[PDB]
């Protein structure tokens, strides 16, 4: 700037010290914070965090928490806690099934789960995604294709 130049300086040099540097922003630390990425380059960060399912229809508050908690979801796939948070944009946590609620030794299929999801914000559609959105959390052969839903 003007101060950077020596004290004996013209008004021409004093103006050029504000112009000839011409500083620029460096938005480089914001590329790896998902809560501070811009919306135009957000699916670049979603690839390297291995975000398995993604929709270009969510709000920005619903897009950044799906990337920030992508570590915790894949860290403990089997545990119920990750299942609670994989349904993040659909605000829904009602009930989870277990063995002893059914008395005759489980269903044939060794108790595949029929989870409960409740959505009041959106009523149109939202059914045909939930059988494949929960597919990545589901193991390959520990669970079967039986499913239950609720609107």
């Amino acid at each position: 700037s003007s101060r950077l130049l020596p004290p004996n300086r013209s008004s021409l040099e004093r103006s050029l010290g504000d112009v000839l540097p011409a500083e620029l922003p460096v938005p480089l630390r914001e590329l790896h914070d998902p809560a501070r990425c811009e919306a135009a380059l957000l699916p670049y960060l979603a690839w390297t965090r291995s975000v398995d399912r993604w929709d270009p229809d969510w709000s920005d508050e619903a897009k950044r928490n799906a990337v920030a908690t992508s570590f915790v979801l894949h860290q403990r796939k089997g545990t119920l806690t990750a299942l609670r948070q994989v349904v993040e944009p659909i605000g829904a946590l009602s009930e989870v099934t277990e063995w002893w609620q059914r008395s005759p030794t489980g269903v044939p299929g060794t108790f595949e789960i029929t989870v409960d999801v409740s959505d009041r914000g959106i009523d149109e559609g939202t059914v045909l995604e939930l059988e494949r959105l929960l597919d990545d959390v589901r193991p390959v052969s520990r669970h079967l294709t039986r499913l239950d839903l609720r609107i």
């Binding site: 020596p6 004290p7 004996n8 300086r9």
Partner: protein
């Protein structure tokens, strides 16, 4: 943090340093104050104006 000093004891540190380094006949009016790190309401003296 930075606190505001009355800038009168720092001048006494210059009248007592310039007499032991340059003599009492030498004014302290261009000598450094080592402890300071600021000046409330900073003054302007650019080059030769």
């Amino acid at each position: 943090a930075a606190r505001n000093a009355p800038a009168s004891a720092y001048a006494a540190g210059l009248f007592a340093w310039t007499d032991a380094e340059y003599g009492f006949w030498s004014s302290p009016s261009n000598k450094e104050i080592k402890g300071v790190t600021g000046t409330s309401r900073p003054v302007e003296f650019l080059d030769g104006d």
